[PDB]
Amino acid sequence: FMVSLPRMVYPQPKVLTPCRKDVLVVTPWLAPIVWEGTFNIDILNEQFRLQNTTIGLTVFAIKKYVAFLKLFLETAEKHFMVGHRVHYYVFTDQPAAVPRVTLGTGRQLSVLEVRAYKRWQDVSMRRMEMISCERRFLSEVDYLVCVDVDMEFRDHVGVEILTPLFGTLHPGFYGSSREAFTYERRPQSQAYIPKDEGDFYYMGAFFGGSVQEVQRLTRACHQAMMVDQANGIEAVWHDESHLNKYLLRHKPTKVLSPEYLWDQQLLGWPAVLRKLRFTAVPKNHQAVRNP
Ligand SMILES: O=c1ccn([C@@H]2O[C@H](COP(=O)(O)OP(=O)(O)O)[C@@H](O)[C@H]2O)c(=O)[nH]1
Ligand SMILES: OC[C@H]1O[C@@H](O)[C@H](O)[C@@H](O)[C@H]1O
Numbered sequence: 001f002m003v004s005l006p007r008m009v010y011p012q013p014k015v016l017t018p019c020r021k022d023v024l025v026v027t028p029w030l031a032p033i034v035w036e037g038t039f040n041i042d043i044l045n046e047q048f049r050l051q052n053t054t055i056g057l058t059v060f061a062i063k064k065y066v067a068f069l070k071l072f073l074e075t076a077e078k079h080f081m082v083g084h085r086v087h088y089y090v091f092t093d094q095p096a097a098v099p100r101v102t103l104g105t106g107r108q109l110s111v112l113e114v115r116a117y118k119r120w121q122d123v124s125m126r127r128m129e130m131i132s133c134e135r136r137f138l139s140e141v142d143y144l145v146c147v148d149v150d151m152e153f154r155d156h157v158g159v160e161i162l163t164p165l166f167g168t169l170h171p172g173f174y175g176s177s178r179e180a181f182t183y184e185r186r187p188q189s190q191a192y193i194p195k196d197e198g199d200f201y202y203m204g205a206f207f208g209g210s211v212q213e214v215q216r217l218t219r220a221c222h223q224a225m226m227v228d229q230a231n232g233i234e235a236v237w238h239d240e241s242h243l244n245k246y247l248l249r250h251k252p253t254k255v256l257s258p259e260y261l262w263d264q265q266l267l268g269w270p271a272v273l274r275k276l277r278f279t280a281v282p283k284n285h286q287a288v289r290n291p
């Protein structure tokens, strides 16, 4: 049950004036696509604080990737869900390498030790299995957000993203035709998507939803990965290929714009992005992924 919102004074929405004319702000299945200028964060904060919403954030920091945790967590403290209850779940093979970051009130961090796989591909792929400790999240949070660690927050990421199931537009493909999307194209893989199908190319680095929908997604992607393994096939882009297949067949109830997953080194700061909220930290793939 949801109580009434309080009286609030804010600018009237104008029906014959769009917030954004340059971009698509709603998908064909009537899910909002979240860009700056489409939301009044004061209305949304009130809605979600009246539900006493708790947001869980999962992040994996395996082997050398523990080096990314200090910046990831300190910038999350400045920009992620501030004002709301937040539970960070840091999955790592080195609990003593987790930095001691100072947290604001109402925010907590749990360290979950897990095994380290040798291949960076398996480390990345096995997050779906790892996420899918399930009774724990149902008791502790309302929503789960699942992100890469080699990242930093630079601007607001808040309750405008929350919904039963979201994906994020990959910053390399948001202007691309679907034939150019790097979906898995071999019919032998569970992740296969034909050239004439696909709405968007979603990023594996940022998805989330309610706990129920995230466990559905991560269980289905892990099951599909295990089928591929038994068939001796590994999808072209690993968990991201499976996430794409799942979100094609189970449409997300919001889509985040690429404000929410950007790489300023590779892609700069285009005019269509009013804010760069969550961005890649430069790294050397070969060095950081191997001993
Ligand atoms: O040795 C590794 C390789 C990957 N990861 C995790 O898997 C995510 C995805 O891999 P990565 O960021 O390397 O993929 P990219 O964004 O470079 O495609 C990382 O953010 C970490 O959360 C990790 O912890 N240790
Ligand atoms: O083509 C898809 C790939 O695009 C790259 O930019 C990215 O680093 C990979 O993680 C994968 O998303």
Ligand SMILES: [Mn+2]
Residues within 6 Å of the ligand: 148, 149, 150, 205
């Ligand atoms: Mn990454």
